[PDB]
Design a protein around this ligand. Structure first.
Ligand SMILES: [Mg+2]
Ligand SMILES: [Mg+2]
Ligand SMILES: [Mg+2]
Ligand SMILES: [Mg+2]
Ligand SMILES: [Mg+2]
Ligand SMILES: [Mg+2]
Ligand SMILES: [Mg+2]
Ligand SMILES: [Mg+2]
Ligand SMILES: [Mg+2]
Ligand SMILES: [Mg+2]
Ligand SMILES: [Mg+2]
Ligand SMILES: [Mg+2]
Ligand SMILES: [Mg+2]
Ligand SMILES: [Mg+2]
Ligand SMILES: [Mg+2]
Ligand SMILES: [Mg+2]
Ligand SMILES: [Mg+2]
Ligand SMILES: [Mg+2]
Ligand SMILES: [Mg+2]
Ligand SMILES: [Mg+2]
Ligand SMILES: [Mg+2]
Ligand SMILES: [Mg+2]
Ligand SMILES: [Mg+2]
Ligand SMILES: [Mg+2]
Ligand SMILES: [Mg+2]
Ligand SMILES: [Mg+2]
Ligand SMILES: [Mg+2]
Ligand SMILES: [Mg+2]
Ligand SMILES: [Mg+2]
Ligand SMILES: [Mg+2]
Ligand SMILES: [Mg+2]
Ligand SMILES: [Mg+2]
Ligand SMILES: [Mg+2]
Ligand SMILES: [Mg+2]
Ligand SMILES: [Mg+2]
Ligand SMILES: [Mg+2]
Ligand SMILES: [Mg+2]
Ligand SMILES: [Mg+2]
Lengths: 98, 96, 136, 48, 170
RNA sequence: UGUACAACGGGGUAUUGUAAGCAGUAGAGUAGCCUUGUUGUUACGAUCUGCUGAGAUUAAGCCUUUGUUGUCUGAUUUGU
RNA sequence: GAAUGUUACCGCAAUAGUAAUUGAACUUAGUACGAGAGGAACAGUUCAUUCGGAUAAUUGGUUUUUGCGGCUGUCUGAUCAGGCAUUGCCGCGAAGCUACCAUCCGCUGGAUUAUGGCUGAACGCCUCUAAGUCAGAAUCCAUGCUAGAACGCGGUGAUUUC
RNA sequence: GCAGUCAAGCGUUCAUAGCGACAUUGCUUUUUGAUUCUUCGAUGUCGGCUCUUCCUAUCAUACCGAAGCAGAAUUCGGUAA
RNA sequence: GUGAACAGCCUCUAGUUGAUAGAAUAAUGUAGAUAAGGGAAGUCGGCAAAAUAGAUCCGUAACUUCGGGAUAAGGAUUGGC
RNA sequence: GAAACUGCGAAUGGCUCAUUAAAUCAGUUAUCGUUUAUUUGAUAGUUCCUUUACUACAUGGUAUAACUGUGGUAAUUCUAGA
């Protein structure tokens, strides 16, 4: 059970809802309702239709805290040193000087 | 979690958003029956045991739902829950 | 449907009554197909026989190589444009009505099928599964 | 009360949709507990 | 689907197999790079945070970071790019690719450990596999041991022992 | 005379697709005053943008409501 | 809908009507039969035709929601906001109605016909028949379903005082 | 128009599996005739559309008996509207 | 005013607001509309209905009495500022 | 000395004669109208910085194949994460 999205409006399409158009090239277009489906048939461009996800993305609308910071990182520092060479003497020959 | 499912699990009831149209909520035990029933919304109905034991294999099939559509019926329904709505929507001129 | 179709076709909305003309989607020289009959169809007075996705018809070629005209041949409907409904609940429609001339056993006269193809049709006729590009 | 859609897997060995999901229409009957207010006995007669 | 996990500290790696949707479904709608808290996927993995690095769907096509989409698409690919090795100078091939967004169609999910858990994992935190080669160029030797430009590398180069029968070499 | 009923108001649901008002270094441009410009200034200019998925409508056979206001004996008839 | 005391609730069932139809594929099976060419069926399964009764989650249609937006002409000085153009025109359009254009559902017992039989005389033999009797059909009767006799009926509640 | 009876013939042989001459007995009233009883102070012609119902001399579907029925197919017949 | 316009549509002056009324919005109608997929299969017959349309520019067949056929056919374009 | 990187080559060769009629091609010109790997000959004291408390020149930076290991697909001179 996938929930698809509207290839025009960017809306979730829950099962058995809206219509599915298979174009000549075999490109499949899914619509949630007859609004997108007609606006699509009219050769409307979603980026010009103010209530569209696509329109909103391009106009930077309401996103906010997805542009705010976060914390994801690590701190590691582990010692392997090398294969076929005794790793015993790899920390004895590494005390550094400076 | 009445309209929830083993595969859905999200706490929600069978009542669509904005309610059932021309009825109400359904705060009591309910019968989900496959297909359509004679009679219209609000009408008293009588459910009655079968008069024969059907070996049909169409009956005898033991169903388990995956999902129960809870989206608004009055208008073209998008969202299942006010939670799920508020998610995709973002924030609006009223809100918190 | 009928001869040579392996399997059973769950009912689909009927979009192609007799006299409809549908694009011929193979390479066999026919430009289009005019439907004069729908195999396996019923009898009810004044109801026009009508075909859907994956249906066997009897057609004539209205435009195409003159060796293909002025005669009857079986044909198979690969594209619909009248939205039907599947059991997975989606209402879907192609952009054109389209078929490909076949024989009584359901073997295409052409070597290829230009354009997509309904799965209900591919499942039903194997030699369509052969010649098909993107299906559904 | 009304009707709504359902999604469930199909168990029908032999079907083309066996084990694939189907969407189906269902109705919901608001069904709070009835209360038992009385009993009525009936006897047979040659008139019924 | 199969999980393929890596521990880029010990150099450890090993796979796993999860069949339950509720276990898996944690990964759905998550992109490549989004972090995952591990108690959801299993009890062993509680405390582990996973990074989603990629994977292959059924039919095997690789994912590609940046596409978004939870499906397969076909792109033009040039040199210096994922899921393609050019055969020829200035050659581009149009190849299928699986999106960066995880889905139930994936046969394998690629994983990388970020934070350790509260429990050790069998072939990951328990075993540690050493780096194959050590420094070769001059100043990188000086930055593995911190020697400045005085200390004279030549004695600090790594030396790997090997045996010819009864002759052990360096 | 109360889990009462109604009229508004609120909240949800839904429909359209961004209201008026103001602001702007947006605007093909264009006029006018001189102190003729080292953004000179004052404006006017389809349209664009921001406040604004805003505004408007939403039971007339949608859902809901602790708020508001009001209503709660007029008429006839019936007996083995 | 008057009248069989009044009013109310729950019921019975006489009579009457009645409904389901046909096909294909898988499998049986390349099987039975045949020299070969050819080539079935019963049980099981998946669908379908024609018909019927519903129903509107979804999809589609419908639009005076004259709900929102857009447009022409003009009229209110401009502005806002509006009027008129026999519902001015256009796109979307909730609700309702609605479509094999949409979805869901369509019961199983008995008695018989033809016909094949049992037992068995007439007619020491013989016979499905004369006496008696078994099996039997898209038939028939019931089950089921729709009315409910406004002159068929039952159980039950409450039954007025100025 | 439909259906019998005799059975000379047909059917490799074989009257009746399926047919049937010469004859002959009948049934039917969607044929056409014959008649002129009703209607000429008026019963609106052909066909189609639409819809109902009835008949059976059954084309299909149910169950059967025959076959010059190996099977497959078909033919004849019965109960059947 | 719009526009080619004494057209249609809106308006000033003037003149009307006369046409039984109230409440509903069943069937069937009369007048006005729309309909997915198909597209004359409807029917005596495309009957009815739909489609076309103004202007500017491009383009334009047979045939001809040389005057035509011709807006042949076929195309592009059109607001605001 | 595999593998792989880096470089160079794959624009030469070979085949065919479809298109092509002032095009091609031929002989004859022009580049004072241009690009040119390679070959061959030449060709470079200048690189920093308010210019004493100096700038790694005894030589500055990582990030990758092969490789190691974990994998995906019925399938390819497919390739993923580490
Ligand atoms: Mg609609
Ligand atoms: Mg007809
Ligand atoms: Mg806005
Ligand atoms: Mg009395
Ligand atoms: Mg077989
Ligand atoms: Mg033989
Ligand atoms: Mg609707
Ligand atoms: Mg308007
Ligand atoms: Mg007028
Ligand atoms: Mg029906
Ligand atoms: Mg029963
Ligand atoms: Mg008897
Ligand atoms: Mg009665
Ligand atoms: Mg009574
Ligand atoms: Mg014989
Ligand atoms: Mg003979
Ligand atoms: Mg003889
Ligand atoms: Mg007369
Ligand atoms: Mg008379
Ligand atoms: Mg008369
Ligand atoms: Mg008469
Ligand atoms: Mg014989
Ligand atoms: Mg009058
Ligand atoms: Mg009037
Ligand atoms: Mg009407
Ligand atoms: Mg319309
Ligand atoms: Mg139409
Ligand atoms: Mg035609
Ligand atoms: Mg005709
Ligand atoms: Mg006709
Ligand atoms: Mg005529
Ligand atoms: Mg005619
Ligand atoms: Mg005529
Ligand atoms: Mg006309
Ligand atoms: Mg139209
Ligand atoms: Mg212009
Ligand atoms: Mg060459
Ligand atoms: Mg780097």
């Amino acid at each position: 059970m996938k929930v698809e999205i509207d290839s025009f409006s960017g809306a979730k399409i829950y099962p058995g809802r809206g219509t599915l158009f298979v174009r000549g090239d075999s490109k499949i277009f899914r619509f949630q309702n007859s609004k997108s489906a007609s606006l699509f048939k009219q050769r409307k461009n979603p980026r010009r239709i103010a209530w569209t996800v696509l329109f909103r993305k391009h106009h930077k609308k309401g996103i906010t805290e997805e542009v705010a910071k976060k914390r994801s990182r690590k701190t590691v520092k582990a010692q392997r040193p090398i294969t076929g060479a005794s790793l015993d003497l790899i920390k004895e020959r590494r005390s550094l000087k400076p | 979690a009445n309209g929830a499912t083993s595969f859905d699990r999200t706490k929600k009831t069978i009542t669509p958003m904005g309610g059932f149209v021309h009825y109400g909520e359904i705060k009591n035990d309910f019968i989900m029956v496959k297909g359509c029933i004679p009679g219209n919304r609000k009408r008293i109905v009588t459910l009655r045991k079968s008069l024969y034991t059907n070996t049909s294999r169409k009956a005898l099939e033991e169903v388990s739902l995956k999902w129960i559509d809870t989206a608004s019926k009055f208008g073209k329904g998008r969202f299942q829950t006010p939670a799920e709505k508020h998610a995709f929507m973002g924030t609006l001129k009223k809100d918190l | 449907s009928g001869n040579g179709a392996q399997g059973t076709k769950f009912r689909i909305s009927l979009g192609l009554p007799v006299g409809a003309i549908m694009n011929c989607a193979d390479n066999s020289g026919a430009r289009n197909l005019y439907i004069i009959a729908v195999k396996g169809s019923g009898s009810r007075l004044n109801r026009l026989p009508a075909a859907s996705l994956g249906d066997m018809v009897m057609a004539t070629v209205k435009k195409g190589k003159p060796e293909l005209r002025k005669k009857v041949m079986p044909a198979i409907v690969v594209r619909q444009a009248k939205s039907w409904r599947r059991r997975d609940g989606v209402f879907l429609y192609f952009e054109d009505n389209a078929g490909v001339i076949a024989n009584p056993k359901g073997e295409m006269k052409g070597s290829a099928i230009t354009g997509p193809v309904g799965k209900e049709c591919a499942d039903l006729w194997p030699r369509v599964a052969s010649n098909s590009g993107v299906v559904v | 009360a009304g009707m709504t859609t359902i999604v469930r897997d199909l168990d029908r060995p032999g079907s083309k949709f066996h084990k694939r999901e189907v969407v189906e229409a269902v109705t919901v009957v608001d069904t709070p507990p009835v209360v038992v207010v009385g009993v009525v006995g009936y006897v047979e007669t040659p008139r019924g | 689907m199969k999980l393929n996990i890596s521990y880029p500290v010990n150099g450890s790696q090993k796979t796993f197999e999860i069949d339950d949707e509720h276990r898996i479904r944690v990964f759905f709608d998550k992109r490549i790079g989004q972090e995952v808290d591990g108690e959801a996927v299993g009890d062993e993995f509680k405390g582990y945070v996973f990074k989603i690095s990629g994977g292959n769907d059924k039919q095997g096509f690789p994912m590609k970071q940046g596409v978004l989409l939870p499906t397969r698409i076909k792109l033009l690919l040039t040199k210096n790019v994922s899921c393609y090795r050019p055969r020829r100078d200035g050659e581009r091939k149009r190849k299928s690719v699986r999106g960066a967004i995880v889905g139930p169609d994936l046969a394998v999910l690629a994983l990388v450990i970020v934070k350790k858990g509260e429990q050790e994992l069998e072939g990951l935190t328990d075993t540690t596999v050493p780096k194959r080669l050590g420094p070769k160029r001059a100043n990188n030797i000086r930055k593995f041991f911190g020697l400045s430009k005085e200390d004279d590398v030549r004695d600090f180069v790594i030396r790997r022992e090997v045996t010819k029968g009864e002759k052990t070499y360096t």
